[PDB]
């Protein structure tokens, strides 16, 4: 909701309130998602200022508040800052922001991250270039300095974050992305590589001096139709954690595909089908394991622009003999989301 | 504060800044509350959208920020998401919302939860149906026909918390009220399955109910509520270091408050809750209240334990808003 | 940003989004400030209502850190800065809650650097910074006679750690180029007295013709906390001698170059005796774009000895802050 425009500074304060619930077989411990309450609410601001006819300043922020938690010591469980950065867009030169932003490989992963509740499984938080990552400088360029229409590229730095845990750690990195949209159709191809922290390399699973992610995507966005498809492979990046022995680490090689097909009613109902598959290779002692693999049947009915409900049943494809203990039961979400 | 209204969507962003200090004998170890700083702040949003003339959508949220905490490692303590739900009201059919909302037994218990700071002692958080409870589906003047009487039905899904205090299972709850002639009646009850963790506590189904009768007119507030819980109320022991729920409790809440247009609102209240047939000690909070809250405008305002020295060790001895 | 005026009530909801990063040789083991990401965000409200003709506030401010991951460390740095009053005619103000310390009034004249500076202003350290639950009576323009004064009550705060604990105390400040002086003393906590290693400054400033010349001196008495890397033991400097010098000229162009020198030295601390806490030379060039978006560089020449008692480090910030 735009709540202030004066002396030429726009400030949008937005928020959600998703009443959410997962259903699986008796506390879905062996399922895709889980079981019970998932109610959460977000609260961020978008702020743009106009210094010149060409130069604008922005700063975005976004915090996650969890409603499933009690008022005990776990009241903060899941509370986190999703977005926090500030930047300058200048004429046709391009934009530049630093802070906690998306990774270049999310530009490519964005094409398919569109299911009502689930999807975008490959887009891990604090996993280098596929999602929210702390302290990252990002230069983006739209329409190649205004010359070519549709061709966009971006270039990302991503500085070192020596975390206490190896799960969220990262070192000096480099990332790129390229897109081309031509009347409905869309192609994209991102790639990024970074040094792995010594704590990450001292993990049981996964070996290699540096981490690497890339993915390429196609989409059709016209006539109230979305057909999204992307594929990507990580090498020494994806967290995997064996459920049996409770020993975590990174997958030496992954092969990930996302297919999304949804149609949009002007009536409001948006049915969605989706198939995802992320398969690990060269697992330190197991070999080829399926991280995630399923079919999706989703129907979101937007009431107005400020209110909706949705259902996301996920056909869990993972066989019971999963040599990593990853869930094999089915999950279905039921949500009523208000926003502003 | 209503901060946005456009294209059929009202959005209210509200907040408080209570500067509060507690006073008891010395450090108030065995007191009602505590002693020292108690400063805190609320900040939440309310948000209704008009889908139709009949169908309106809503969403609320509220989070607590404590001020008495230092800026160090303890800064997050007390910070909690109070309210968070999203629902639909439809013509005279009624409302339905899911998320962290108010329990049906609070509808009847809320008749007396109107003291300045204290009061509503039986309204325990994450305690089945008597307070702020996580993830709960809630349906709330009889199809528009009979005005002045409202009913509600609540579901409450299972919540497998680490601690026994906050856990629960599948349940059912009802509430029915009737208000007229500046007065109101209400009666709510609920029952639920307990987790095996809950069943395995020293001190497997929980029951809680209460009724309330009140009168508000001529700036006079006369509230009374009474009810009993069964295998619900947590209490634990300080001496024995043993936690658990009370087999049965006997709870009464008596409030009388008069609002003087001058601003001073004197409030006299008496509360009493006695646990029954507790496994170890048998039958064992109760006090009389003195309160004067001074309403300035629509924003600014400012504002006797009867428990013998007890086999349990129960204690003895300015708000801006927008 | 004022987001609501109706029925004579102003509700200003403000916020920032600072993209910060510290630079040091390889890692920040033996540096002043640190190294890596420092991105954070502020978000509070300033709420004033007029009750009558003469008598009229409620303020709050929370910290959200951005260098944290969405793992377990997400609330690392998250905290409330402010939460609390009335001003009546010429009587003056009075508020209770988590607010500033009276010794900050003198320290505030020099707490004016891009990112660093104001080292004497520790959080929850007697009266030199942000402290919880304090009644503060402040009077404006001396009842309209001339001069400004304030009195803080500072309630007891029985904290688990010795560093963040506090008891009852009293502090005063008076201000009127510009000069100011503040003093405060309080009963030390049980754990304050039971620690191996309290009373506490006056200020001068000149803010006119696009120049800011700031100078203040202060001495601590068993309140400034410190620990040493060698013996890993917490405590309090029995006495410190603190100086802050700030000299900056603000161009109409927008660029604001700043040079600053700070020095705080502890005295007869039970264990190390007289040691120098912090000492450096600062060169900063903050560039205000407009009244919202701005950036800054903050190079700091660390004047702490290598062979240093307590082993304090022997840095340069780069920020791009949007605000509202
Ligand atoms: Zn995002
Ligand atoms: Zn409530
Ligand atoms: Zn402050």
Author numbering:
A (entry chain A): 1 to 340
B (entry chain C): 1 to 140, 143 to 205, 209 to 289, 292 to 310, 315 to 320, 322 to 329, 336 to 340
C (entry chain B): 1 to 56, 58 to 85, 87 to 148, 151 to 180, 185 to 205, 211 to 213, 215 to 328, 331 to 340
Reproduce text from the manuscript describing this model:
As a result, two triple mutants, R82H/Y102H/R132H (OmpF1) and L83H/Y102H/R132H (OmpF2), were designed as the parent templates. After protein extraction, purification, and refolding, they were isolated as β-barrel trimers, retaining the native overall architecture of OmpF. More importantly, both proteins possess a mononuclear Zn-binding site in the constriction zone. The fourth coordination site was possibly ligated by a water molecule, which is again suitable for our studies. Of note, the empty coordination site of OmpF2 pointed toward the periplasmic side, whereas that of OmpF1 is placed toward the extracellular region. In particular, D113 shows proper orientation and interatomic distance between the terminal oxygen atom and Zn-bound exchangeable ligands as 7.9–9.5 Å and 4.7–5.1 Å in OmpF1 and OmpF2, respectively. In addition, D113E mutation (denoted as /E) altered the glycosidase activities of OmpF variants; OmpF1/E and OmpF2/E showed substantially elevated activities, whereas that of OmpF1Y/E was somewhat reduced.
We supposed that a protein containing a void space, such as β-barrel outer membrane protein F (OmpF), would be suitable for our study; its overall shape resembles the structure of host compounds, such as cyclodextrin, which may provide a structural basis for various functions, including catalysis, by encompassing guest molecules and forming noncovalent interactions. We inspected the constriction zone of OmpF, the narrowest region, approximately halfway inside the barrel-shaped protein.
